């Protein structure tokens, strides 16, 4: 894998010359398939290509019109590198500069990029940072520590903790330019409160422009349950496996090990598959129990009760789920072509109206030429004045595909349909 390594100072005095170098590893600067390029990025102007150098039995140079009078990109075949020279810089040249490989004459994509160099146009002198500790003044399991890095110029600084050993819970804030014209930022880390007495925490600040590395030791003085039904498609297909899912969140580390007891119409069952505790990013635990349900049992209105017991709750949390009670009603399925007013667009809407169904549990999918179409959204079921439900499904297709006469189909799975399935086609007349 080809690598580009950028070097050169980012701080340039106004009217002076910006000089950067891009060292290539894994490819040749003389490659007949590559173009060795420079691209800059700034908020507001965005990504802007500056130019390229490339060899095709002769060295060629191409530059963006805006910088043509001040730019030079020179290859060096001895060191396998290429440079950027931008003369008479102004504050408008402040940006991140990247070198990049444009490759393959047939595609000309930029597949390999340098790390970028932050270029600041300023007459101000380079100044290394001062670093101060951030420690609490004086119950809580987690503590925060940090370092305040200030009075430096230009950007950037790199901050590490314990020489790079500590990365978890580290937040290094973006720098802010102060009224003094110097930058300031803080780097923080959250650590276990128990470790504060035995473990040391040191921030390391690298400021390459001033060639300084600064070290600073920083010295210091519930559960919820959710019960999910099976997916409507699973209950209606004998080849699919319907399941009810019990999820426990906000389980604490201090009070773990949850007890899962199930009840099918009040009768305890012991075939559930309980997964082990999973630690979350917010330091809590999540536990999941999955109970395979019999297709006909769910469809006949059986009740599935999940009882959860944990030290965090005195009264055991219970949740009960079942299919909606009431007489099942067959859905009517209608396909509607795009409006003629929508034919002015590159993309058109294919509509599927599904109405008169009960219960609201339903599955709607789209297909074309025996393959699933995924660029659709279906509304939730909506209650009609007659107690039944309706919804609409909208498939977005390229106008060309619709105009070509391709047949699109809306498939619906519901318990009140014959063989739990119906399909309705839609194509241009």
């Amino acid at each position: 894998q080809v690598e580009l390594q950028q070097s050169g100072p980012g701080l340039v005095k106004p009217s002076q010359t910006l000089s950067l170098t891009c060292a290539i590893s894994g490819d040749s600067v003389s490659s007949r398939s590559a173009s060795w390029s420079w691209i800059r990025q700034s908020p507001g102007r965005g990504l802007e290509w500056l130019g390229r150098t490339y060899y095709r039995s002769h060295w060629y140079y191409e530059y963006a019109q805006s910088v043509k009078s001040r730019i030079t990109i020179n290859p060096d075949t001895s060191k396998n590198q290429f440079s950027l020279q931008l003369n008479s810089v102004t504050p408008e040249d402040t940006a991140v500069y990247y070198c990049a490989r444009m490759d393959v004459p047939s595609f000309r994509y930029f597949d390999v990029w340098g790390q970028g160099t932050l270029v600041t146009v300023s007459s101000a002198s380079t100044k290394g940072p001062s670093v101060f500790p951030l420690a609490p003044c004086s119950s809580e399991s987690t503590a925060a520590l940090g370092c305040l890095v200030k009075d430096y110029f230009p950007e950037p600084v790199t901050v590490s903790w314990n020489s790079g050993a500590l990365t978890s819970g580290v937040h290094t804030f973006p720098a802010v330019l102060q009224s003094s014209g110097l930058y300031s930022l803080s780097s923080v880390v959250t650590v276990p409160s128990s470790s504060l007495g035995t473990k040391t925490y040191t921030c390391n600040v690298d400021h390459k422009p001033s060639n300084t590395k600064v070290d600073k030791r920083v010295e210091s003085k519930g559960p919820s349950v959710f019960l999910f039904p099976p997916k409507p498609k699973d209950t209606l297909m004998i080849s699919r496996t319907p399941e009810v899912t019990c999820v426990v969140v906000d389980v604490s580390q201090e009070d773990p090990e949850v007890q899962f007891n199930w009840y099918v119409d009040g009768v305890e069952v012991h075939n559930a598959k309980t997964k082990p505790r999973e630690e979350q990013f917010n330091s809590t635990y999540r536990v999941v129990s999955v109970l395979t349900v019999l297709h006909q049992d769910w469809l006949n209105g059986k009740e599935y009760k999940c009882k959860v017991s944990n030290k965090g709750l005195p009264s055991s949390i219970e949740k009960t789920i079942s299919k909606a009670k009431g007489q099942p009603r067959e859905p009517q399925v209608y396909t509607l072509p795009p409006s003629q007013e929508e034919m002015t667009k590159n993309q058109v809407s294919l509509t599927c109206l599904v109405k008169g169904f009960y219960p609201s549990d339903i599955a709607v999918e789209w297909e074309s030429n025996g393959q699933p179409e995924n660029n659709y959204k279906t509304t939730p079921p909506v209650l009609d004045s007659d107690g039944s439900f309706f919804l609409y499904s909208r498939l977005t297709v390229d106008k060309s595909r619709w105009q070509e006469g391709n047949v699109f189909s809306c498939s619906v799975m519901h318990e009140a349909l014959h063989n739990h399935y119906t399909q309705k086609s839609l194509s241009l007349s």
Partner: protein, 215 residues
């Protein structure tokens, strides 16, 4: 130069949702010369799609490109939290190569209240003549948060600055620092230093404080 207009400028979606990013060209672009890039904070843009529809090396299957002429689309079939990035389209059908202005993809997640911490200025900084008091709001969502500085119960104005981290690629949260800057003289004039935080995740504002002299 060919102009590439990206829409929407910002896209906020939950993990598991489909994302659709549009790129409209001012002039027809030959499909082989339309590419998509993904740029994460502090990194160079990463080639995602080339030749309008070809997945680049090491790019996950959830990313796909489509379209032709003047209308191109990048689709993320099922969003992952690590997909937080700015996505750019790029053309080289006609020289010079040009880029779109990007679509910033933000990851929706459940509301998370900030964990609040207050830091007094160190004795070392105090001797230099400046007192920087720092308030930290850690791992919260949404990004909207209010921080008020109270010095001896008196509301502060114009003497504090805020900085926010980019959305975390794993937990989709933000962190924020609020720094109150006073001279050593103005700092020793008062005793109670407090930062009051207001956020959607907090039923009532959270105050963290310290008394100057107890540190």
């Amino acid at each position: 130069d060919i102009v590439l207009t990206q829409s929407p400028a910002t896209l906020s979606l939950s993990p598991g949702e489909r994302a659709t990013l549009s790129c409209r060209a001012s002039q027809s672009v030959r499909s082989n010369y339309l590419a998509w890039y993904q740029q994460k904070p502090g990194q160079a843009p990463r080639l995602l799609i080339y030749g309008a529809s070809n997945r680049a090396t090491g790019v996950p299957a959830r990313f796909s490109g489509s379209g032709s002429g003047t209308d191109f689309t990048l689709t993320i079939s099922s969003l992952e939290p690590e997909d937080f990035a700015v996505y750019y389209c790029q053309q080289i059908s006609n020289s010079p190569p040009t880029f779109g202005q990007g679509t910033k993809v933000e990851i929706k997640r459940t509301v998370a209240a900030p964990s609040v911490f207050i830091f007094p200025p160190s004795d070392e900084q105090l001797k230099s003549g400046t007192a920087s008091v720092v308030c930290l709001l850690n791992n919260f969502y949404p990004r909207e948060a209010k921080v008020q500085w109270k010095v001896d119960n008196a509301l502060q104005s114009g003497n504090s600055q805020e900085s926010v981290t980019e959305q975390d690629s794993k937990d989709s949260t933000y962190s924020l620092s609020s720094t109150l800057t006073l001279s050593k003289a103005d700092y020793e004039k008062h005793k109670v230093y407090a930062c009051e935080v207001t956020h959607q995740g907090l039923s009532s504002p959270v105050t963290k404080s310290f008394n100057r002299g107890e540190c």
